[model samples]
Target chain A: TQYIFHEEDMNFVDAPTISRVFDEKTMYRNFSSPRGMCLIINNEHFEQMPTRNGTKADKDNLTNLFRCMGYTVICKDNLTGRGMLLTIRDFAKHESHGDSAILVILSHGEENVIIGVDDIPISTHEIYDLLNAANAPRLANKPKIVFVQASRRKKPSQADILIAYATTGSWFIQAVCEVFSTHAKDMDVVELLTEVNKKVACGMPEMTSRLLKKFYFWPEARN
Target chain B: TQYIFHEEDMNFVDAPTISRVFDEKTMYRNFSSPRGMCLIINNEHFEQMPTRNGTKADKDNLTNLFRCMGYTVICKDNLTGRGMLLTIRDFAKHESHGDSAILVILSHGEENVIIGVDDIPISTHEIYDLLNAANAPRLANKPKIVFVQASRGERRDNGFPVRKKPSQADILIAYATTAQYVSWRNSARGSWFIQAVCEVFSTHAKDMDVVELLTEVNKKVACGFQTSQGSNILKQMPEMTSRLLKKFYFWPEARN
Candidate 1:
């Protein structure tokens, strides 16, 4: 069984387990079939900004990567501000999001604002709030991995979500495509993402995690 | 020998050591004894705000941990915004900050503002500025890790949140919780954030990179440190925005 902790719970007790914090995954188990939803929201052409090049390539590549891991990939291209929010609302309530999720955004973002085709900004904070516990109970306690292929500064994050932002170049997604495809079988999601952080550190990339459990994308092991 | 990165250098090529990123540990190595300055700004008794009870627990815990890790712990109890700035200015020029530096803020904060004892909010950005390359040349080209443990307000639930081309490099900023959420504190035992930090760093700082160390910190808080506040399990997940150019390790205590 998994373990939960108290105030001084993570104290310097057991050397190997480290106060029983890493005993086992505290969250529930996951199923094999319909692993989860991997939503790829691609915004290549903006209404006011320059067309985002190289995103389609990222979109197509990440699609195959997530699908290979048993996710049902739903690809949406060229959405407006409202369209993006609408999709998030719908994606949060999708029947396929029973176990886990991967939200991929390929667009233009700056100054902590994620932009869609209409040049309108999408709230990254609200994005997380939309998928939170009651907002998406099926998503509760499950890993919600997001790859924001946009540029921003001092990125913020939330609980149970792992968000990686593209800081300098497409190399952020390139690293994800490489590290993820190679280690999806063995590496824990956060560890591979850490490797991705190292791989793209030269690009000034950002990687943060709030996953409570050790989530693995064991495609072959899935039912 | 060590490696230094120019932009876009960490690409995909090798399997064992992807794209030469791990060609070698790039940042300057960590040596034993005097492993940088652990500047502890514990703002427990705010002038206008209520006392941050149990913060001394955190201060002492972290102070002890860093000292064990061979750091010179500089503890400051309460300071006004001006007091904090002066101390920061002094710290910027300190001879003790030669190797590396850590700036820890344990206080009352909301909406990105870290408050000092006078209830005057210190500019978080300026805190980084004063410790920057030009502002403090001694800290330049070296690793700077800042830990902020405070609340945004009263709210439960931590997201699986879980940044960008951060404006700065060679620095990692770790926050106790995400925005708009209150960071939990136990009157008896410090905070979940610091408790996890002291626990994790004590056990793993010897080998783990500060990046991975904070990730483990995030996990430890998200899972074990949940509190049932009025029938709801209030969650707090720590987040780190890393601008580190290379792998950074504490290498825990040994003179090279």
Candidate 2:
């Protein structure tokens, strides 16, 4: 079947949801004024071996691209568990004119947990809950972009914080493997992201809605 | 030194040959007749494989894309040595009213050689020779286009990707890029040429030259790389060497 839809007729979906919140002493800019803060956490290394294509390059490249595209990109390498949790709490405590915030965690992970330095497991939801905490005044109703590039588990657990994986777990392939082969043999992540981005940005509204529905269709879909 | 040849400008090195005359018999009707031909060849299973993305879908998608733009598309696949050569010869021998001719070949390849089923090699010049022979007084100065999606060589030997072998005619050959670089595709987005061609034909080419439209393709592919594949360095910039100077668009716009 031949179907064609021109650009400009497509509609993008909603903004990302706020994951977690925490309480602490808020920083004041001057005269009891507070400046909004954005916290970004990147955890790329854990038990998984480093990708030859260099996750560092991916981080740096995307960071620079997004920065040029106008996001005050704050990026860092592997962080300790305490450091990760503390950093989230601190960002939730700050205030500013910035109405939106983004937190990207790039790390080797399993279903609901991110492996920190020394193979420590950190719940993805904990970070979000800390941001949604009652004491954190600057975070409610604000747009929070959370990008998690990792694997996800099926079974439910104690951590109430929601964890969103970059892709559905079964389809996950190491990004480095893609850097070596051509499309004639296997599909690559670049093409996958490019397609996903294109679909989300320019796909028909009906198509977009359908994809979202499929993405969040059932109990298996939600976890 | 740089030489700029404007539209309608004719530069001939020698008088047209008889072989050129026979070829023109078919060319006159095809070019001067005011219709276009879309030829798609899917040549899989060759000695050296073309990138995997250049498959029947590439041909089918292109044929449909052209049909959408209003052209009579002739699609073929797995051209065994004889079938591949005969198809070109038959197209040359047939009469049509197309203002331009477009041939897209997908197969295993090497510098200047397109492979047939079982890995038989055919120089693009041979196919063009057939077209050029088909060129006559009636078809005098029409544009002939051939889009080839294949590797110029088995490997990137130095920086020279296209090594010239011998050929029988004068025609424009558009390689996906210089030799050694790779062509890319996604199961979802399609090959770079198909993507870029669709982009130009759909939006940019109504008032642009064919070369200008293809230049856009080169630009798109030059920077398009796959991050998921270990071949992060792959790019498919189309290189076009054309003899035509006239302003050409698949679909014409007003005032030109």
Candidate 3:
């Protein structure tokens, strides 16, 4: 009897894991297609002014890393408010072949306010609305990951969405983390991301859809 | 006498010691001429990306600081390379009433690159090229100040700017530290730039220019420290290339 292990509403706690059950040909039949396009928008510098580390290598490394991981990465720097709107519109409007779209925004922001190159302010909802699946049919049932590394610098309202903030309301430093521990060099974001990738990738298949959806919902804490 | 301070030849001293002689009126009289445009870009994400205490307040205060200082402060999340390029191009294309332009980059970076959203790479030279006097003729002879606060991830190649025949001047790029060095920060006090900015402005002279202010910044960053050794190293020094003879200051307020 041919059976598909189709699961939607199930949860498994402490499930044992296995790898390499089949060869490339068998795996290709099951999970060989590329799934998503990752677009990273970095606004480090303002046109009429300087930036802190906006021109540094962090963004470059990230773009490269994603590209190496088999995702087409579109990266931009120092966009104005209008520019951001246009970028979101274009990305949303495009015909994405993947099952999902990932968006990363790195810039200076306050609660509900993100700065553009011309010192204009853009709201998170504005961009979110543009990317709504209603307007962009291709994004339907597709997971959209928005990682924002800026400060709200104010109180929060109730209208936010599937967003993972760098901190509750902290400034996003260039390196993200610095270790000043006298015993050893402090760990930073690079190390954090590396470990996250290792653990998450290994544990992904076992995660139920409900669990996958809830991963970003919890509050982030320092160990 | 007129003199040009190039990058390598310029000995970056720490902060300068001067009495407050310049006031708002003086600043207006000097930098308020028909050729100056101010642009302030603040990036507080690189350090605060990891949830931490009081980081939001620090960046928030920084945004407010520039705004209170009469600048068109443009703050963003982590920026990518293309984003930075686009922002700079727009600024270079601006037809503001002022002759000079000021650009500030606050983020984590190595010597030549800065981190953007999701850690993309943007180069500093790309920014300078946007306002290259040769390309933007209208902005010729105008001053451009670029203050970078990223680390030079690795050591910079030791080589002097190619000795070309003496030519006209136009841009000034200031780094937070020497090549291959790191910038330090604290939970409560602030970045070195903030401390230096306040110090120089408080002790500034009427004739003091941005370069002079940077000299003071270098001193404060290098020597002034309440904690941490790396925090005390002066990473930034103003590297200038200009044809104009007039001096400039963000805060022109003078004290008689």
Q: Specify the highest-TM-score model's number.
A: 1
Better of 2 and 3 by TM-score: 2
| Most DockQ-accurate candidate | 1
Question: For residues B214-238, what per-residue lDDT tens digits would candidate 2 score against the true structure?
Answer: 6555544443323233542232335
Clashes of 2: 48
- The iRMS of the candidates, in order, is 8.7, 23.2, 26.4
Write down the RMSD of all candidates, one decimal each.
11.5, 22.4, 23.8
Q: Candidate 1: list runs displaced more than 4 Å.
A: A1-23, A26-34, A152-158, A201-203, A219-223, B1-23, B26-28, B82-86, B89-95, B123-126, B129-137, B158-167, B211-216, B226-233, B245-247, B254-256
Single out the weakest 10-residue window by summed lDDT for candidate 2 chain B: B157-166
TM-scores computed on chain B for all candidates? 0.84, 0.71, 0.66
Give one digit per residue, the lDDT tens place, for model 3 in A1-223.
Answer: 3211112211212112113332321111112134356678787777554463533455654454334333567887778999988997888777853645657777777635677878788986577656544455555434455556653211011011134344221222222211111101122122232223223222200100100111110101111
Candidate 1 residue-wise lDDT, B66-131, digit = tens: 766668889888888888888887887887674678888898987567788889887677787787
Alpha carbon lDDT at B62, candidate 3: 42
Here the TM-score of candidate 1's chain B is 0.84
- Give the winner by lDDT: 1 or 3: 1
Q: Candidates ranked by TM-score, best first?
A: 1, 2, 3
Candidate 3 chain B weakest ten by summed lDDT: B157-166
lDDT of each: 0.69, 0.45, 0.45
